[PDB]
């Protein structure tokens, strides 16, 4: 996160760390959607141009964290992946279209003060909150500056959704229906962004109807971190929802 704040304890109990077994190392953020499933960006597992292609075991999930780096002895929980499911039509070749994957934990985790799943949107919740101007919230333990570093605690920032056309006009990349961008305008005089290490993290909204938190997006990609005239791009979780249900009453 660039231009964030330190999260408060228990502010994002669904936040999850993807942790490198060896070299032990922070891979990306993810989110807990049930006691056995985690959602992340397909590009934290499989990214062929960078030679990245992680397996169920080069991998470890860390839940209920606050500290980026400390083993948080009676708060965090660590699990093992039973399996990984990548969107069959994820496009690493040109723009990360469909940047989404599901991770099924070997054993379910138990909920607590620091661990609780985020809700997945319904077609009507999605309908009313996904509007240019509405803010959402991104959390991560990534880069604090485009290039220097890494924070000591979970960082947080609130950003506004931007209209598609401005989104498309900020870059040469081809934007699809499964993406949405976010951030302030150079003239809004407020700023902040997701950055390296934040990927696979959740972009969330609080529903004013039921007072519940909804995961609307997954941090996917950007072009620099916090540059004027650029925005962050997020997977549109509600558009990918059929794919989610399906892998869940399939292998769940």
């Amino acid at each position: 996160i660039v231009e964030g704040s330190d999260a408060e304890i228990g502010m994002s109990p669904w936040q999850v760390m993807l942790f490198r077994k060896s070299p032990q190392e922070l891979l990306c953020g993810a989110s807990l959607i049930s006691d056995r499933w985690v959602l992340t960006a397909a590009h934290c597992l499989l990214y062929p141009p960078w030679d990245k292609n992680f397996t169920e075991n080069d991998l470890l999930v860390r839940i209920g964290k606050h500290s980026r780096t400390r083993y948080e002895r009676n708060i965090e929980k660590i699990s093992m992946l039973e399996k990984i499911y990548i969107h069959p039509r994820y496009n690493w070749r040109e723009n990360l279209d469909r940047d989404i994957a599901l991770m099924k934990l070997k054993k379910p985790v138990a909920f607590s003060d620091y661990i609780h799943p985020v809700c997945l949107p319904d077609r009507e919740t999605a309908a009313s909150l996904l509007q240019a101007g509405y803010k959402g919230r991104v959390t991560g333990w990534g880069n604090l500056k485009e290039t220097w570093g890494q924070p000591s605690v979970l960082q947080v920032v609130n950003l506004p959704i931007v209209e598609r056309p401005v989104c498309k006009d900020s870059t040469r990349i081809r934007i699809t229906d499964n993406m949405f961008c976010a951030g302030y305008k150079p003239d809004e005089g407020k700023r902040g962004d997701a950055c390296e290490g934040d990927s696979g993290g959740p972009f969330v909204m609080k529903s004013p109807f039921n007072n519940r938190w909804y995961q609307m997006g997954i941090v996917s990609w950007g072009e620099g971190c916090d540059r004027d005239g650029k925005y962050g791009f997020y997977t549109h979780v509600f558009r990918l929802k059929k794919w989610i249900q399906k892998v869940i009453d399939q292998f769940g």
Binding site: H43, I173, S199, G222
Partner: peptide, 4 residues
């Protein structure tokens, strides 16, 4: 593109 910068995968984040």
């Amino acid at each position: 593109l910068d995968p984040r």
